[PDB]
Amino acid sequence: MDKKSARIRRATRARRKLQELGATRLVVHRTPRHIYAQVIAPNGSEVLVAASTVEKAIAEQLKYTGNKDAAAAVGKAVAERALEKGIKDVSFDRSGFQYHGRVQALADAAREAGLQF
Amino acid sequence: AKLHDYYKDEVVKKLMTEFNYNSVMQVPRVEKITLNMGVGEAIADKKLLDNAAADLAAISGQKPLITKARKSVAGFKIRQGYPIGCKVTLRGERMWEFFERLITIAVPRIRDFRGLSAKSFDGRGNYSMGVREQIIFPEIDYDKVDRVRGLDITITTTAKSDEEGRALLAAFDFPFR
Amino acid sequence: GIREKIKLVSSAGTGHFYTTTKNKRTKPEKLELKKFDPVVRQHVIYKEAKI
Amino acid sequence: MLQPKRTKFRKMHKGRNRGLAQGTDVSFGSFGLKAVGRGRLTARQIEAARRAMTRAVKRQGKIWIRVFPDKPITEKPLAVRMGKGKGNVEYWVALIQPGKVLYEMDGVPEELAREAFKLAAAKLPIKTTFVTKTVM
Amino acid sequence: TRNGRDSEAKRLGVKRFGGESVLAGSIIVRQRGTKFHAGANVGCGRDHTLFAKADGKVKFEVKGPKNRKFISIEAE
RNA sequence: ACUUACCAACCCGAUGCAAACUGCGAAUACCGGAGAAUGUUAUCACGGGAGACACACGGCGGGUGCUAACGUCCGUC
RNA sequence: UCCUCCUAAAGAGUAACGGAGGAGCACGAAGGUUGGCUAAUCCUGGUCGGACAUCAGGAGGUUAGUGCAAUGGCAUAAGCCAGCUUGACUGCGAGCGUGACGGCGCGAGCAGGUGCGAAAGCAGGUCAUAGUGAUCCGGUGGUUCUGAAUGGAAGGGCCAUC
RNA sequence: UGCCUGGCGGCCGUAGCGCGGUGGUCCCACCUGACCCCAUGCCGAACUCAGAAGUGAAACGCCGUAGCGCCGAUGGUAGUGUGGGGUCUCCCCAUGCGAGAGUAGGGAACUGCCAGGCAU
Ligand SMILES: [Mg+2]
Ligand SMILES: [Mg+2]
Ligand SMILES: [Mg+2]
Ligand SMILES: [Mg+2]
Ligand SMILES: [Mg+2]
Ligand SMILES: [Mg+2]
Ligand SMILES: [Mg+2]
Ligand SMILES: [Mg+2]
Ligand SMILES: [Mg+2]
Ligand SMILES: [Mg+2]
Ligand SMILES: [Mg+2]
Ligand SMILES: [Mg+2]
Ligand SMILES: [Mg+2]
Ligand SMILES: [Mg+2]
Ligand SMILES: [Mg+2]
Ligand SMILES: [Mg+2]
Ligand SMILES: [Mg+2]
Ligand SMILES: [Mg+2]
Ligand SMILES: [Mg+2]
Ligand SMILES: [Mg+2]
Ligand SMILES: [Mg+2]
Ligand SMILES: [Mg+2]
């Protein structure tokens, strides 16, 4: 299995469970250069809020978009953006990535900024 | 690391003009070097495996994985999960350091050496060879060896063909016919 | 057939016990497991003894 | 004499023999012998008929047998009462439905094939008829 | 050697069909494996019994890339 | 090491067979909702009284037997 | 006696000295959870090494695997590994299935307490379906019950277990 | 609004495979480095971290293409409920239902949310 098909397999179980639970998930996507965060509604097809390093307002304050400091910036931003829209309780979907390093920097910052999970 | 430099500084260049590749990312690369010992008779003397393992460890410079019987087969009287060999997968710095030791001094110390075969390619650019005696590696202390023992070498490549795989080794001055 | 009944006894003062089985050949030592003691209403260490 | 070399199971329900045949065209040879009636062909019958048609052509040309006796038939012997287990397998039949091409042939003149198939048909317990290859 | 044996029938099968209104907890199908899978408001027991987790109507569907069978429960 | 008019699995093309085969699949039957007409409640519950638990043939679908039996065993009328 | 398949007529059930097999156990991990992983078979190359051991690539795509019969499941694996572990928890249970009955099964949720996980969550044994013996009598431990004038005790009850 | 890309879903092969072509500013990918976080029953392959010298070779995406997969009528055929009938191991008639395979043919998916790059 190639890296990607392998990760999607790694992600399927947790997503079905969250789907079953009807949870609003904070979905993360990581790349060597960029990291992305999306709060998606239980229907699985609507993005309520989002943040990432490909948007200039965020990458502008960052040294390198593909590291842990950046991950902390993205996480903090989704949280804020999300809280301002009344969104508070979500579930973390690490999307087949280890709960670690960058993903965990993003998660920790998102919690820091009041997002509940 | 010296032979990784020689790959970059010298080999890439040679193969690009040899096969007229459009992208340098087509030039064949040594991907990994895998050493193996089919021990096989550790089933009677478990210690034969330990000494094979330690032979590889000292040859490769990294802890060997000991490989189990994938499948019982009554012909060699082996049950599934029986330890029956040991292996080491070399990459990066270690593979290159070994690759040189192999060419620069191990292989030359084969008895009445006349070169290695150039037809031992699998049909997709990967090369395989055996050594009969592990004492050709100077990491093995001739006085201490419990026993002379042999060893598989396979050089896995990103060449798609044997013609390409051969140019890659040839460019390192790999000894052939 | 060879598998014998044993009782795990509460390490608290209570005389509460769980009952289970054991292969005494392959596993000669004393089975020891945290379990819930309904008399002190807490999880406590339980230790094999004879049935 | 035809027989399955091995089978999953030794014995078989009686079952029934309704329907029209599959394999109703001459698909290999030039001529065919076709069942018009319904019934069971035993391995010995199939053999007797194969011999007859093969004498008739002096082992010239080529012959195909489209049927295969894969149904085991059991029987209870004399002086045994009912029950006490299903009988023992004694022989093998092919189930025949109207329309099955039984044998095919080619490499001989039509006149000789009709004769050979005539001799063979006299060995069979079901009425048959002579058929020919057809474009489409 | 000798035959002559069989086991008691286990009465597996669908207990409530499409459209049927059931109370939560009601067994909808007894099965040996997951021929049917648990969908929304339907649970899977240890013997792969599918049961209602909510009051409502039984609903069979076919879903996903493997064309699998799912039983769910619709509020009514 | 080389070869023989021998046998040859797998694979490709063509042709059939299966109660314990299915990449297909009815008619019916069965479960559930709603509605009219009809039907001496034909329904369910509790309670008083039982009898019965040797079945037969015929039709259809089958196992067994020989698609034998006024045979034998189930299903259904 | 029990389990699996067919007969069994596309819901359940359905007989014969009908056709085929299996159970009367195993496991403190082969249980729980988190995290990860992915077979068979064939072709080519490779010391000893052979049709078949272990190594590499390619085809293949679950035909493998599942402690064990068969059938149905299984990739989000139910298959395979490791870390931490004892939910193989105690009290209950809306609502159901299956039984003439005795019974047997499935079960979300509630209270207490626990393991694993960052968290959502998962765990009341094992992919599921065999692996079993009513009552009586008696043994062992526990006990706010009983205790033949009264206080005890014996014996009885109740709970656990043999 | 238009093209391009990434993410998350709907749908579950008319949607897949193959063959040919094609893309790197952006995105994606390979990639670079690895003491360290973290990892390998061996291996920085994978997981992971710090990056940006190189390349779209592979992968991925897009466009093309009926070798295959897939979908697929009409008509006939098979079966079958009810009623009737025959030469009753099997069939026929009336009525209703009506496959499977094959044939013609279709087919190189369709679609929503958010974000990024480019252009008018
Ligand atoms: Mg009554
Ligand atoms: Mg009686
Ligand atoms: Mg009777
Ligand atoms: Mg009767
Ligand atoms: Mg009679
Ligand atoms: Mg049935
Ligand atoms: Mg029926
Ligand atoms: Mg297991
Ligand atoms: Mg997991
Ligand atoms: Mg070989
Ligand atoms: Mg915790
Ligand atoms: Mg006493
Ligand atoms: Mg007294
Ligand atoms: Mg007294
Ligand atoms: Mg890398
Ligand atoms: Mg390319
Ligand atoms: Mg066309
Ligand atoms: Mg129609
Ligand atoms: Mg249809
Ligand atoms: Mg059709
Ligand atoms: Mg078709
Ligand atoms: Mg936009």
Q: Give the integer Cα–Cα distance in Å for D128 and E55.
A: 67
Among left, alpha and beta (phi > 0; psi -120 to 50; other), residue B142 is: alpha
Ligand 2 centroid vs D43 CA: distance in angstroms? Answer: 49
Gap between the Cα atoms of B125 and B158, Å rounded: 7
Torsion of CA B106, B112, B115, B117, to 10 degrees: -100
Extents of the domains making up chain D: 21-136
For D21-136, CATH gives 3.90.1170.10
B51 within 8 A of B34, measured Cβ to Cβ: no
Non-local (6+) Cβ contacts of A35 within 8 A are A28, A29, A52, A53, A65, A66, A70, A71, A74, A102, A106
CA dist B161 and B151 (Å) reads 25
- Of chain E, the end-to-end C-alpha distance in Å amounts to 56
- The count of structural domains within chain A is 1
Angle among Cα A50, A54, A56 to the nearest 5 degrees reads: 95
Q: Which tokens go with D97?
A: 């439905």
Radius of gyration of chain D (CA): 17
Q: Distance of CA D37 to CAs D21, D99, D113, Å?
A: 10, 8, 21
Measured from the alpha carbon of residue E14, the closest ligand is 6
Q: Assign domain E13-74 to its CATH architecture.
A: Beta Barrel (2.40)
Method used to solve the structure: X-ray
Nucleotides of chain F in contact with protein CB (under 7 A) are 14-21, 31-33, 61-69, 71-72
Instruction: Indicate the number of domains in chain C.
Output: 1
Task: Answer yes or no: is D99 CB < 7 A from strand F.
Answer: no
By CB atoms closer than 10 A (0-12, 13-18, 19+), residue D94 is buried
Measured CA to C1', the nucleotide nearest A10 is G76
Is the torsion defined by CA of B44, B50, B55, B60 positive or negative?
Answer: positive
Of the candidates B30, B168, B138, B173, which has an alpha carbon nearest to the alpha carbon of residue B91?
A: B30
- Start-to-end Cα distance in chain B: 27
E50 pairs with which residues across the strands? Answer: E29, E44
Task: Fill in the amino acid letter for A84.
Answer: E
Which residue is nearest nucleotide G143, judged by alpha carbon to C1' distance?
C15
CATH of residue A34? 3.30.420.100
Which residues span the domain enclosing A73? 1-117
Identity of the amino acid at E57: K
User: Of all nucleotides in the shown strands, which has a C1' nearest the CA of A9?
Assistant: G76
Strand partners, A93: A27
Shortest-distance nucleotide from B62 CA to C1': H42
Interatomic separation, CA of residue D9 and C1' of nucleotide F18, rounded (Å): 10
Question: How many Å apart are CA B156 and CA A109, to the nearest integer?
Answer: 44
Exposure string of B26-62, with b = 16+ CB inside 10 Å and e = fewer, is bbbebeebbbbbebeebbeeeebbbbbbbbbeebbee
Q: In what order do the strands lie in the sheet with B127-131?
A: B65-68, B83-90, B30-38, B151-157, B127-131
d(CA A6, CA E6) in angstroms, rounded, equals 46
Domains of chain B: 1-177 (3.30.1440.10)
DSSP letter at B32?
A: E
